[PDB]
Structure formats: structure tokens, C-alpha cells
Amino acid sequence: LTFQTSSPAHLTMPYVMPGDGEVVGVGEPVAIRFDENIADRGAAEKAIKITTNPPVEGAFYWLNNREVRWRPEHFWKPGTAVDVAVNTYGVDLGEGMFGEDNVQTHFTIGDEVIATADDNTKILTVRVNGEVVKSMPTSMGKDSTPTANGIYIVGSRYKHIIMDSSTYGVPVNSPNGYRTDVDWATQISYSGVFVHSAPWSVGAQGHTNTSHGCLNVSPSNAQWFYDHVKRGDIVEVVNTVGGTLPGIDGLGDWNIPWDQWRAGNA
Template sequence: MRHGGLRAGRVAVVLGVVALSAAFTAGVSGCSSGNPPVRRAVAAGSGLAMLRPTVTASVRDGQTEVSPAQPVTVSVAGGAVRRVTLLNPENAVVPGAVSPDGASWHSTERLGYRRTYRLRVEAVGLAGVSDSVMTFRTVAPGNVTKPYPVPLDGELVGIGQPVVVQFDENIADRWAAQNAVTVATDPPVPGAFYWVSNRELHWRPEKYWAPGTKVRVDVAAYGKHLGAGVFGQDDAHVAFAVGDPVIYTADDATKQVTVTRNGQVIRTMPTSMGKSSTPTPNGIYLVGNRVDRMVMDSSTYGVPVHSAAGYRVNVDYATQLSYNGIYMHSAPWSLWAQGSQNTSHGCLNLSPSNAEWVVHSAKRGDIVVVRNTQGPVLDGADGLGDWNMPWAQWKAGNAGPAPAPAPGPAPIQAAGTR
């Protein structure tokens, strides 16, 4: 994987201090009734020396392992920011902004990984100008991982669709990853996180979504240490909406799949499900990916293709129902059994026309209920079986013990007067 690194540059931030300078002039060069001003020597360490501005920065000179996700901040006590210049290794200026009161500055562009920066701060006060210079280096990750939110941005989903964040590396610090994810809903809906694998995090409410709910997901992973030397490669943001409630009910007692929308039956389809040696699990499934054609290969779940139970076939109009290989799909070879007998390896066989209708009509996150089979219940951590896990267990989560709060870095003071 490529490592993150960002170019920084544009303009330095300069704060005019005309009013402040005028105040200083009035304070140190006042006159009395036409008499010449009285000049007094000021000894080092006297009260005037104590009036020099003090600069506090979020980084210190020589510091390493600085997070590139956090803005560099500067504050001034006893004065105001005159000029701040933050340079990257190419001597380009990292942009920043001064606060309205002139007492602080912060960078406005994120930094890059494994890069050295030079920070110079000039502050003006009653006793002159403080000029501070420091150099620091950002963290060098051992590896980086990119977050991929599901659903896609702008997608209309079914009432069962969880928020999903997939990573392309294993996540050792699950709490750090969870804390990087923010879920906002309209109207507000409480929910909870659960990890279905070392690379996939889900968030769902206690009950199915209400149609019309809008959801926004922000993953602020960049610069975050996610454990074992792995850092977030980038941030990610998606927004999606919940559509009409559509429920597919596959009943092994009737060998039929009944489809309802808003509680009204809109289609009934004969099916052939898993035979007695490979029964289809009961429970609540979610519609996942839909494809017009795919290759189904038994070796992907441990059964050699050339064994008695093995297969490798092209399948049309396949709708994913689980991560462990269960699909609704076109099966013209089992038309004779659909509606009367189970013959599959666990999938829901449909006629070509019915399978095509499902692929082109179903939404990601639509509910599929399988009942009355000889199989167990689909695992709640399958990846598309979220609703089979009791809410109390889901809400408790599985990120491990909550970490103790880490103390923030102590501010570093750097002051000098010229």
C-alpha cells in the first residue's frame, strides 16, 4: 500500500498589529507638561522584561511522531501574533489562520506523514517581539489502511441496511477505529457498533430504519493510529437515505418466496433451497451486492471443485444474501424442483425471470427472512446477518475493554525577545 504524504503550501499568515503597536507607543513614549521625557534604565529580569510575550505551541523543537491529522496551534500570552510561518520540506508554506483577537494561530491544511516541518512564530508585546523557531517531524507509519464506507454515497437502501466501514488491513485497536467514525441521522436514531471481522465495523439501530431516514457517515481515519503500527490513510464521507420497506420471505414449508412492499404482496416466486445435507440457514438476511453474472466456486468455502460435492459454474442474476456464499440466483437446471423440492447447496434457486427481477428491483439492505428449514440460524456476525444478533449483545459491542483516557501533550513554551 502506498503511504500517505501531502503537499502543503500557499501563503504565510501575517497579522497587522497597528492598533496594538500604537498602544505600545503611547505606553512607552508619553510626555508630561512639555518637560522632556524621563529615561530610565531597565535592568534584566525587571518588570518590563516580564512583559515580553510568551508563545505556546502544540509542538516542541525536535519533537517526532507528531500526528499529521491534528492542526499545529500557537497561542500568545501578553501580546499578539505578528507572523507565523510553517514550512514543509520543500520550503512551501502551510496555510493557517489567526484568531479574531490575534492571540492564536492554527494551520488549516493537514500535514503529511514522515515529513519534517519548520515553525517560526513572531509575537509582539509591550516589551518587544518574541521570535521562536522550532523543527518537528510527523509520524512514519509502518503501514496504512484506507476506510471504505458502505452504502455508497447517495444510495437508497432498505430498512435493514447497517452502516458499514471496511478496512483493507486488520485493525488491532478497535476503539481507535470506532472513535474515528461518526454516524448522524435525521431524525436522530441511537445505535451501536459491532465488529463482524478484524477488518469490518458495523453500526445499526435497535430496530429497522424508518423509511425516509437520512444518514451521514464520517470516517476521520487520517493520522489516527489504529494499532500495530497501522495508521489511517485517508478520511471518508458518505450520505444515504432509507427507502420503502421491502421484505422477502422464503418459507421452506411452501417452497415459495413472497415479496412485500409497504406490507402489500407484490410478487410470489417458487424456490428450491438447500437440500438436507446442506440446508439453508434460517433467520434474517440482508440484500448485499447484485450482479448479472458471476462464477460460483465451492472451493471458496473449502469444498474442492472436483470433489463429489464440488462445483464451479457460471450463474446469472445473483443477489448476495450472506458473506458465506448464500445467494438468490437464476437456476434453470432446477426449474423442475422449484416450489416442491430442495436441491441446492444452500442458495435460493429461482427461475431466470424471477432472479432477474430481484437483481433489478432489490435495494441493498432489503430484508430477506428464511424460515422453516432444517438449518441453524444465520450467524449475526456473518456480515449480512446483523439482525440475528440480540440487541443487548450487539449494543455491548466487541471492541474489547475501553482504553484509559490518554493525557494530552503538555503545551511547549518557547519564548525569546529581540
């Protein structure tokens, strides 16, 4: 170990996801997020060594100036082991900013879990290693606030969460605005799409879209989803009147075509 000099005004620390020792689903990218904007992306990428077993090709793509992702062309094979070596200690990351430390993490890929929300049927079907294990009636975004189509990575889960329109700049007093207590909420986009419990739309689930974009399901089905679907599992939304989830959403990585992803943006 060679000492590197530092200043708290010219350091950036990397934060790696997923967590060390975690089992994640087949859609989980490696994520390295810095606590500062990175001017020299090529330097960051050169300092990050990702090894896979069985080996699979993958590549870096920056979602923004703070966060780089690495993934293969297709969903991970279940059982793959992934080692992430972020060797940034003392690395010049541009504009006088230096890497503060090294970070080192390992994780493994679990079962293939893919839930398809089909707007033509209003059914969310959960498949594990190809086989249907659950079918849930759902109510997605109304035509004026539709659910975007595309591949969503499952993120964090909450037994309870508050949906407050003011975090989107829409006052709760507005026609228009809302402040809703929600149970059993699984996040699937940074923009704010969740699968969650919605007793108020149970009669519409399987029939009519009534939400602001979220995937409304029954309390029991939302708890099932909370219990059985893990970070990195996949939700694919198809056949809505919405567009496509942005590839740089935070959980929309798989919507970027592979040739653009692999070419990168460093």
C-alpha cells in the same frame, strides 16, 4: 487542516459502505472496513461520527478485526438520511498504525422491502411497505446442505456469476464438486447464499429442496429479483432444517441480539 506525517508501512485506509449518495434498503448497516487489522477498536469508534435524520439510536459492533458495523435496533425507517464522518486522519489506531485519511459519505433509506422465504410452503414472498408484490416458488438447500434460517441483508447482484466449489476447497472433480454458470444472482450472505436463476430445478421449486443452500427460483423470477430488490433490502428465511445464519457472516448483522450488539466489542 493540520498536517500528519505518515509512512506507507504504518498507514491504514478506511473504506465506507454504502456508497455516497446511494439509496439502500431498511437493513443496510453502516460499514467501515480498514485495509489493516485494527488493534485499538475504541480509537476507531471514537473517530467515527454517524448522524441520522430522523435521529435514531444505534451502535457499533465489530464483525472481525478489519470491519466495524453500525445499525439501529430495528430496521431503518424509510426516508431516513444518514451521514457518516470517518475522521481517522492521523488517528493512532494501535500498534503504530495510523489512519491515512478522512472519509465522508451520505446515504438515504428507501422503501421497506422484505422477502420471506418460507420452507413450510417453499414460497419466497416479496413485500414492499407491507404489501405483497411478488410470490416466487423456490427450492432451497437439501436436508444435507440446508439453507440457514435468519435475517439476510441483500448485497451485490450479478447478471452472471460462476459458482466453483474449489473456492470452498472442494475439487470440481469431486463427487461432490461443481462448476456452474448462474444467471441473475443476488447475494444475500458472504458465505455464498444467493437468490438466482435455476432452470434445472423449476419442477422442484415450490415442492422440494434440491440446492446447495442457495434460493433457486425461475429465470423470470430471478431477473425480477435482480431488477427490483436493492442492496440493504431484507430476505428472511424461516422453517428450514438448518440452523441460524451467523451474525458475523457479513450480511447476518440483524441476527445478533440488540443487547449484545449495543454492548459492542471494542
